[PDB]
Amino acid sequence: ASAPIGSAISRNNWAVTCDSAQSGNECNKAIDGNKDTFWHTFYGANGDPKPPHTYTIDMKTTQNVNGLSMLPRQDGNQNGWIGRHEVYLSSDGTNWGSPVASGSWFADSTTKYSNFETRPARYVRLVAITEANGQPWTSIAEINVFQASSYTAPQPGLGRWGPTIDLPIVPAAAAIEPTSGRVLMWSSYRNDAFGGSPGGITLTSSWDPSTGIVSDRTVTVTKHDMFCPGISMDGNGQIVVTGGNDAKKTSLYDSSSDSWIPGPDMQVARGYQSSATMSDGRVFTIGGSFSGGVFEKNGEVYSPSSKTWTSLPNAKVNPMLTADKQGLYRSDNHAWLFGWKKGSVFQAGPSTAMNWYYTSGSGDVKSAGKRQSNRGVAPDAMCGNAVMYDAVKGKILTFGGSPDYQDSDATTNAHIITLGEPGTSPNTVFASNGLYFARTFHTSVVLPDGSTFITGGQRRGIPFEDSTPVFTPEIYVPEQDTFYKQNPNSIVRVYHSISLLLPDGRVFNGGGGLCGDCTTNHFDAQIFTPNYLYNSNGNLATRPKITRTSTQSVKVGGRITISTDSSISKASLIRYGTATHTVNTDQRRIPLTLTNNGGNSYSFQVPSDSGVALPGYWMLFVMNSAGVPSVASTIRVTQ
Ligand SMILES: [Cu+]
Numbered sequence: 001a002s003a004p005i006g007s008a009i010s011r012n013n014w015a016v017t018c019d020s021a022q023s024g025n026e027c028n029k030a031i032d033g034n035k036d037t038f039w040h041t042f043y044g045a046n047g048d049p050k051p052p053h054t055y056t057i058d059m060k061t062t063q064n065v066n067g068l069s070m071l072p073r074q075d076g077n078q079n080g081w082i083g084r085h086e087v088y089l090s091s092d093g094t095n096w097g098s099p100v101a102s103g104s105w106f107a108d109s110t111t112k113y114s115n116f117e118t119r120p121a122r123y124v125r126l127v128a129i130t131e132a133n134g135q136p137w138t139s140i141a142e143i144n145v146f147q148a149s150s151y152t153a154p155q156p157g158l159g160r161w162g163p164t165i166d167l168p169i170v171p172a173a174a175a176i177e178p179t180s181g182r183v184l185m186w187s188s189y190r191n192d193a194f195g196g197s198p199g200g201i202t203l204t205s206s207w208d209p210s211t212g213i214v215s216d217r218t219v220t221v222t223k224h225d226m227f228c229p230g231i232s233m234d235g236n237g238q239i240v241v242t243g244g245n246d247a248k249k250t251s252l253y254d255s256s257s258d259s260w261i262p263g264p265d266m267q268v269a270r271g272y273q274s275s276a277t278m279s280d281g282r283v284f285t286i287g288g289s290f291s292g293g294v295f296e297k298n299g300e301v302y303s304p305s306s307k308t309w310t311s312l313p314n315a316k317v318n319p320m321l322t323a324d325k326q327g328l329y330r331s332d333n334h335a336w337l338f339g340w341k342k343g344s345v346f347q348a349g350p351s352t353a354m355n356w357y358y359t360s361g362s363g364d365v366k367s368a369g370k371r372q373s374n375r376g377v378a379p380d381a382m383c384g385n386a387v388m389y390d391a392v393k394g395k396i397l398t399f400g401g402s403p404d405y406q407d408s409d410a411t412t413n414a415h416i417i418t419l420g421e422p423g424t425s426p427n428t429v430f431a432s433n434g435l436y437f438a439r440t441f442h443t444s445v446v447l448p449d450g451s452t453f454i455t456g457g458q459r460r461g462i463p464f465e466d467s468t469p470v471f472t473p474e475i476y477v478p479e480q481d482t483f484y485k486q487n488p489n490s491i492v493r494v495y496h497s498i499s500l501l502l503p504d505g506r507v508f509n510g511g512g513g514l515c516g517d518c519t520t521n522h523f524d525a526q527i528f529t530p531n532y533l534y535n536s537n538g539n540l541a542t543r544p545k546i547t548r549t550s551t552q553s554v555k556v557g558g559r560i561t562i563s564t565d566s567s568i569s570k571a572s573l574i575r576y577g578t579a580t581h582t583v584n585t586d587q588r589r590i591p592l593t594l595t596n597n598g599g600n601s602y603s604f605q606v607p608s609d610s611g612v613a614l615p616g617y618w619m620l621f622v623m624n625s626a627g628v629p630s631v632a633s634t635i636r637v638t639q
């Protein structure tokens with residue numbers, strides 16, 4: 001089950017309208033309080049007018065709406081279940097504007113919801129674009145609208161939340177499909193649950209930012225339940241999903257052909273591990289005691305070319321273990337991994353001890369010192385985040401987390417780690433004065449301007465519980481070493497939530513839950529539009545356009561020449577990301593030093609060190625003097 005973010009509005013005075021309503025299934029059957037009566041569009045003798053079908057409500061008075069619920073027919077029949085849909089809010093009953101929520105509701109008889117930022121309105125319109133099985137009907141047993149306690153208009157210059165993307169599953173794991181710009185999401189064997197899985201099946205869901213369509217597909221060809229996996233985009237552009245519910249499986253996702261291909265089994269069964277792409281395109285992983293057993297699981301490396309997993313026993317997991325009260329089950333989880341120079345992988349945390357992992361021979365591990373600062377040694381930060389915002393200067397920003405996986409207080413701790421050559425103890429300092437809000441289970445993404453967007457989480461880690469939630473996201477600005485609070489959202493994003501940077505420079509944040517009958521399952525996501533896509537007036541700014549690219553596939557050290565429609569001041573490459581359980585080892589940013597060829601023509605060189613410029617798919621972004629970024633041009637980097 002799920003839940004609305006506000007309280008139900010009294011449906012007494014209400015006035016309802018429908019496009020079609022067969023006698024006996026009146027428009028008002030939907031707001032009568034009886035779950036055995038339902039509105040139903042024309043059918044049979046009145047014909048079967050196919051969808052879309054519209055349900056409009058005049059609440060008579062103005063209410064601070066923040067959500068709605070739709071209850072399907074409970075008589076045992078499937079006819080009328082809504083699939084694709086949109087939710088509009090109006091003040092006048094003519095001008096509906098943009099949809100506050102849209103997506104696709106799962107095919108079943110459970111109550112569906114649409115939760116979105118509070119917006120005062122008098123009318124509510126639920127459009128049923130499609131029917132869960134392709135039939136011509138729309139039948140709503142009970143429909144409700146919700147209101148928040150009060151309305152506070154967003155503050156100017158602090159970004160905006162919305163719209164809401166309704167999903168058929170709980171996106172506990174996601175990635176951007178680089179060749180198509182689609183958001184791939186997956187839950188487990190069930191749409192809202194992982195517990196009690198027979199293995200070999202994964203429900204996936206996609207969202208196309210261009211078209212706004214939510215489409216789900218069931219994957220069984222890789223015989224893999226991809227819940228709690230390791231995720232890495234290899235040197236060949238394929239996404240490498242490892243272990244989880246099916247602890248030894250490896251599933252590969254090819255963006256080009258939009259298909260899943262079976263991969264070789266890992267040497268050691270794992271779950272909740274972290275995998276990181278190396279400078280040569282291979283994939284390194286270590287830890288992961290959530291599944292496949294609880295014992296010392298050392299590093300191993302996957303080769304895209306030979307399609308093999310090779311064990312690296314001497315790349316010891318031991319030195320990176322936290323002091324979790326639940327022991328090894330949690331202590332080797334979600335390592336903060338970063339692919340670096342000469343096949344090395346840097347482990348920044350969550351453990352206090354940081355280390356260097358080597359992939360030559362049978363592997364090796366070398367101590368890199370402790371995450372610290374003048375404020376002292378930093379404690380184990382399980383489920384804290386790590387983001388490489390300037391790979392060129394080996395800059396990593398770390399923050400949040402707690403001593404233990406759960407029943408542990410979050411910290412406001414934040415550090416700036418500065419990598420050098422593999423083997424040398426990197427420099428670390430405190431980041432400003434830490435986070436505004438202590439949080440764990442939160443998520444982050446590096447933005448085009450190098451700033452890091454931090455959102456969601458709770459003050460105290462309690463999986464599946466929406467307590468002590470932080471609704472105010474923060475953004476760190478490296479040039480000022482300052483954190484800035486942004487406009488708050490209304491949906492709790494804790495355990496099992498994700499965040500990804502979209503090709504358009506906006507943030508996709510969603511999920512949380514995945515606990516079956518719990519009321520904390522969030523089958524949605526929202527879009528955050530940073531202040532950089534707005535001008536002084538609060539309007540959407542004109543974005544520079546990348547009119548030409550000399551090539552879209554470049555070797556490390558190679559050069560690219562572009563043409564824009566206006567003069568650009570800054571440019572940056574951002575590696576496509578994947579996300580789950582606060583881990584994202586794929587995203588990273590590269591600040592570009594531009595050469596002005598004149599006439600709005602520019603050139604730049606991709607870093608020759610593939611350890612900085614990891615192979616795979618990247619996003620090219622250009623910014624004008626105003627700071628407004630263009631949409632991204634996809635560049636494939638190869639070694
Ligand atoms: Cu999990």
Ligand code: NA
Nearest residue numbers: 029034037141
């Ligand atoms: Na009813």
